[PDB]
RNA sequence: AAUGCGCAGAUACCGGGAGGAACGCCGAUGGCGAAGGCAGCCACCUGGUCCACCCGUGACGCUGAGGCGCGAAAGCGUGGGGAGCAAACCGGAUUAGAUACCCGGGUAGUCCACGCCCUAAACGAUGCGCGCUAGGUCUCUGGGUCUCCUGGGGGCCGAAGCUAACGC
């Protein structure tokens, strides 16, 4: 499981100013973490189908967000991904 | 010819027949009886009547063993369960104790289409 | 690292001689996957429900360590080799919770 | 009708988790050893769905049973 | 009733063992999931969701042709398994007949792996989201100053209203 410690490295590491615990690039980076961590599972378990459900849901969800930002700071954009590793 | 004086007495009930099965103090066999041991043939057998005499067979059979006492034991819904215990009570045969004991799964084999009906 | 709860039931037909080097394989097997025993409950036979081996009692052992949580299960499974051990039952640590008390 | 007494007002204070609570759990069994409802069992939905998952602990444990012969008739 | 099974000793009983499948009571008067669907117990991995705080982003939203995934049972392929059950089928009986209902047997199948099939009275026969319109009562679950109140879910009765009616 992802915890505190985990998840609380990855959400400073992203803020974009000290106590940003919601912007943009932080939602996105947390999603492509729980993302990730269910891309793992999924390669075993692969009858894990309703798992397989909430993959599909946060890719959207992270897609949607992404899709956000990359209208509104193009730049802010190419950089979270290149500070990432997504639309690949 | 082994004088026993004290047993078991297992009462098989079932909706067809009544078997009785006297054993000594740790489950072994002396003398059994059942609904067709007893002459009736068809579905009489099933009747509680069949039951009672099955019963007092058995009885007689284990005095012969010189059997006083006995531990009750029934396994069964059937008719003539209940003759059964109550004429191994009038049989001199001292009841030491009642006990049900039927068999029931923890939801094992699928039943058979007759006892599934409504499940 | 997670809290749980090891529990062991044994043969109670051992004498201190057996049941000692028992409790050896079993307190070793803890340190080989990484098992802090923060506590323990050596009760000893009781008068079981039923017969679990053709025997009517069994002598029991309770650990309350702190292990890798991977490693659980192959620590649970090890201890199960033993013929002297009928059971091993290990169960995850909780808050008790209190009812009309 | 059909007025018995409740399990828990018999009972004083007890960890609905305890497992190995032999001599309070068994006060939770029928003449049989099945689980007794919550009529009598006096517990709550909550509670009561606890007290199952712990029975069934011990009797895995041997410290509870499955099922007793009912002593009787 | 008969077929069937039993003196190569069955049925009933006690002890031991093998194996497969299902999981009593708790259980509902319930719970979870998008649906299909999901209940022995333990560990691991993992999805959704509700509440409190109201801290962060700042309209990033709703829906969704096509696409893609999932999808009870039966069924198909390959391999494995095979207690019980049981289409076909083999018998017994019933009957005017009996290619049925009842009884004794029984193969596929039911189970597992992997691949496929994509259907249903797949039902609440009631697409999804949001806002707005009396209450009463039971219940599951969370918060609270815990009579009673406040949020989410499950039922029932009913204001206004709706409805061909039933009903909602
Ligand atoms: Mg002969
Ligand atoms: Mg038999
Ligand atoms: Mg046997
Ligand atoms: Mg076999
Ligand atoms: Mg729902
Ligand atoms: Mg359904
Ligand atoms: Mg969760
Ligand atoms: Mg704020
Ligand atoms: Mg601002
Ligand atoms: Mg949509
Ligand atoms: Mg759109
Ligand atoms: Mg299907
Ligand atoms: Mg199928
Ligand atoms: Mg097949
Ligand atoms: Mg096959
Ligand atoms: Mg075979
Ligand atoms: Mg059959
Ligand atoms: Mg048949
Ligand atoms: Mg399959
Ligand atoms: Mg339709
Ligand atoms: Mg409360
Ligand atoms: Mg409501
Ligand atoms: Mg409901
Ligand atoms: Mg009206
Ligand atoms: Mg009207």
Redesign the pocket.
């Given at each position: 499981?992802?915890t505190k410690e985990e998840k609380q490295k990855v959400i400073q590491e992203f803020?974009?100013?000290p106590?940003?615990?919601?912007?943009?690039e932080?939602?996105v980076a947390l999603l492509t973490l729980?993302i990730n961590?269910?891309s793992?599972?999924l390669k075993?378990?692969?009858?894990?189908?309703?798992?397989?459900?909430?993959?599909?849901?946060?890719v959207?969800?992270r897609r949607?967000?992404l899709?956000?930002l990359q209208?509104?700071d193009p730049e802010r954009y190419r950089a979270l991904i290149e500070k990432l590793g997504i639309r690949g | 010819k082994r004088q026993v004086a004290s047993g078991?007495a297992?009462?098989?009930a079932s909706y067809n027949?009544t078997?009785?099965?006297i054993?000594d103090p740790?489950?072994?066999?002396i003398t059994?009886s059942?609904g067709?041991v007893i002459g009736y043939?068809?579905?009489?057998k099933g009747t509680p009547y069949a039951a009672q005499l099955a019963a007092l067979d058995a009885a007689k059979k284990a005095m012969a063993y010189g059997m006083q006492s006995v531990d009750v034991?029934v396994?069964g819904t059937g008719a003539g369960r209940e003759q059964a215990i109550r004429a191994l009570q009038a049989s001199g045969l001292q009841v030491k104790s009642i006990v049900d004991?039927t068999?029931?799964?923890?939801?094992?084999?699928?039943?058979?289409?007759?006892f599934?009906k409504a499940s | 690292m997670?809290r749980?709860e090891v529990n062991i039931v044994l043969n109670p037909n051992l004498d201190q001689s057996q049941l000692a080097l028992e409790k050896e394989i079993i307190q070793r097997a803890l340190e080989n996957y990484g098992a802090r025993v923060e506590k323990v409950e050596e009760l000893g036979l009781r008068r079981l429900a039923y017969?679990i081996?053709?025997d009517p009692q069994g002598y029991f052992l309770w650990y309350q360590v702190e292990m890798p949580?991977?490693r659980?299960?192959d620590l649970?499974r090890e201890l199960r080799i033993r013929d002297n051990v009928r059971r091993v039952?290990?169960?995850?640590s909780q808050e008790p919770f209190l009812a009309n008390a | 009708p059909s007025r018995k007494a409740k399990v828990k007002a018999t009972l004083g204070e007890f960890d609905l988790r305890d497992y190995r609570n032999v001599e309070v759990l068994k006060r939770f069994?029928?003449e049989?050893?099945?689980?007794?409802?919550?009529?009598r069992?006096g517990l709550?939905?909550?509670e009561?769905?606890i007290?199952?998952?712990t029975?069934?602990?011990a009797?895995?444990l041997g410290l509870l049973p499955?099922?007793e012969k009912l002593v009787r008739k």
């Open positions: 499981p992802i803020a974009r100013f106590g940003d615990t919601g912007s943009t932080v939602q729980r961590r269910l793992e599972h075993v378990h692969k009858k894990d189908h309703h798992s397989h459900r909430g993959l599909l849901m946060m959207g969800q949607r967000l899709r956000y209208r509104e | 078991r297992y009462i098989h027949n078997i009785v099965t054993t740790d489950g072994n066999p059994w059942s067709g043939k068809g579905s009489r034991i396994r004991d068999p029931v799964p923890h939801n094992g084999c699928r039943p058979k289409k007759k599934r | 997670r749980y017969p081996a053709k949580e991977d659980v299960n649970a039952m290990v169960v995850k | 069994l029928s049989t050893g099945k689980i007794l409802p919550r009529r069992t709550s939905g909550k009561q769905r007290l199952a998952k029975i069934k602990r009797r895995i499955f099922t």
